Amino acid sequence: SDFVRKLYKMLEDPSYHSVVRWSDDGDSFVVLENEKFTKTILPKHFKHSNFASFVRQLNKYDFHKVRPYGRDAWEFKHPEFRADRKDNLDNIRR
Amino acid sequence: SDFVRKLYKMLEDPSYHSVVRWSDDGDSFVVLENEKFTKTILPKHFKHSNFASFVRQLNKYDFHKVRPYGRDAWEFKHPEFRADRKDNLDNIRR
DNA sequence: GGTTCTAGAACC
DNA sequence: GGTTCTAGAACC
DSSP, X not given: OHHHHHHHHHHTOGGGTTTEEEOTTSSSEEEEXXXXXXXXXXXXXXXXOOHHHHHHHHHHTTOEEOOOOSXXXXXXXXXXXXXXXXXXXXXXXX | OHHHHHHHHHHTOGGGTTTEEEOTXXXXXXXXXXXXXXXXXXXXXXXXXXXXXXXXHHHHTTOEEOOOOSSSEEEEEOTTOOSSOOGGGTTOOO
């Protein structure tokens, strides 16, 4: 899955650690500081700089938001998207 | 309509001119610089600091986005929401 | 009603 | 398929 690969690789990079990273556990990820993520990182990895479209893709492939870390921190979770479970990436789709 | 009133009054204020204002015509409005609008102005007038919820309300009361001004500029339009047509505000609902 | 999360539909 | 606009549903 193209999206999941790009998502994982985005999280594989410590350059972004401050604004996008894995949750301490490693079973969810956090996006925080929408200024720099939306305007700088989204367009690096994707074809837009629009957070709502990033969110849509996450719901499209069966991520859910978690109901923190920073102030404007968004946390999403898929049961099969984890820091160590790197093989399960084509095992996530819709 | 509570939303429309608050929307109009938000646009009635030149403090915000740089980040939220009427379109030159006066028949649509522009929101631009999501940093300052979302984090500073949304919470002044509404019960959140979440742009997507602002967008939802606009679609709920029959505003549409226009397909510019700045870079991350969002423009919305209702036929009956205009700078001079201030009386038509309860004539907008859903 | 307003806010939040998720999804439909349509265009690219 | 991905992106964009709009809307459904549910909780507050």
